[PDB]
Structure 1
Amino acid sequence: ADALGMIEVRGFVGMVEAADAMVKAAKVELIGYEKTGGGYVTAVVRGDVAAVKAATEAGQRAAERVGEVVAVHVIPRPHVNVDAALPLGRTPADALGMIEVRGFVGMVEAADAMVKAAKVELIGYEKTGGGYVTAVVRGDVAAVKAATEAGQRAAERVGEVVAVHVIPRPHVNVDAALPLGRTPG
C-alpha cells in the first residue's frame, strides 16, 4: 500500500500551488482533488512514506503564501478499507494564472481584464462552493504575470478577492489531474 498525503485549503488557488509544490519536491502522483464544498478543497498525492512526507512539508510551506491552510497530514500505510470506500486514487509547458474571488461578478471582471491586458487564454472557471469561484488563464510567463496583476486590481473594486497567484512552469503531473485547460486529451 502506497503512502497518503493530503493538503486542505479553503481556496482553489492555494490547493493548486500546494499540489504543484508536492510533485516538484519528491516523486508522488497527484491522483486528483476532493471538493467538500464551501470553498474547501483537498489535494491528494500518493507514493512512498518518505517521498510523501517530504512533499507534504514542502507543499504546506508553499501554500501558506497564497491561501488558508486548513489541515495537512500524511498517512504512512492506509488501511485497505480506506482506499475501497474513499476516492483516493487507488480504489480497485505553459504558464498558469489564477484569481479566486468570493463572488461570480468579481471573477468575471477579473477574467475580462486579464484577456485584454496581455496575450492570455481564459480556459474556464472553477466552482469550489460557498460562493468561491476561480478564473484560470494560461499563456506566457510574462503575459500571465502582467495579466493577473491587471486583473487583480480591476477586481478589487468589484468583489472580495481571495487569492491571486502565478505558476510560471507547472509540472506535467499537475496538468493531468487538475482542470487547468492543458489536460493532454
Structure 2
Amino acid sequence: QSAVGSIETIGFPGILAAADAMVKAGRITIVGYIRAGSARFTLNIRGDVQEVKTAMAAGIDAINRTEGADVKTWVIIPRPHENVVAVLPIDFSPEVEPFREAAE
C-alpha cells in the first residue's frame, strides 16, 4: 500500500489550489475530495511516501498563497492498512488509473 496524504481547508478555491500544486510537485495521484461541511473541503492523495511529502509541502504553500484560504488540518500515513483503504475514500479508482500509471 502506497502512502496517503490528506489535507483540509476552508473554502473550495483553497482545495483547488492545493490539488493543482500537489499533483504538479510530486508523483502522486489525487483519489478524491470530500465536502466536509461548514465550507471545509478535504483532498486525499496517494503515492510514494516521499512524493506525498513533497506534494503536501506544495499543497500547504498553495493554500497559504490563496486568498481567504487556510490549512486547517493535514496528515500523511506512510503505509495505510487495507481495512482503512476499504472503509475510507482513499482507494484508487479506474478514473484516476491513467494518473496512477504515470506516477509509478
TM-score, normalising length from structure 2? 0.83
Q: Which runs of 5+ in 2 are unaligned?
A: 97-104
Which structure would you say has the larger Rg? 1
Q: Which has the higher helix share?
A: 2
Q: Which residue of 2 aligns with 1:33?
A: 33
Q: Is the 8 A contact 2:32 2:89 kept in 1?
A: no
Deviation at 1:58, TM superposition (A): 1.1
Misfit runs of 4+, over 4 Å? none
Number of positions where the alignment pairs a residue of Structure 1 with one of Structure 2: 93
Deviation at 1:68, TM superposition (A): 1.6
Alpha-carbon separation, structure 1, partners of 2:27 and 2:92: 16
RMSD: 1.6
Deviation at 1:89, TM superposition (A): 2.5
Q: Which residue of 2 aligns with 1:83?
A: 85
Q: Is the 8 A contact 2:3 2:47 kept in 1?
A: yes
What per-residue deviation string (whole Å, max 9, x for no partner) do you get for residues 31-71 of structure 1?
12011111111011100011001111111011112212101
Q: Which runs of 5+ in 1 are unaligned?
A: 92-175, 178-185
TM-score, normalising length from structure 1? 0.48
Q: Give 3-state SS (helix, strand or coil) of 2:65's partner.
A: coil
Q: Percent identity?
A: 44
- Verify: 1:44 aligned to 2:47, yes or no: no
Say which structure, 1 or 2, has more relative contact order (CA 8 Å, 6+ apart): 2
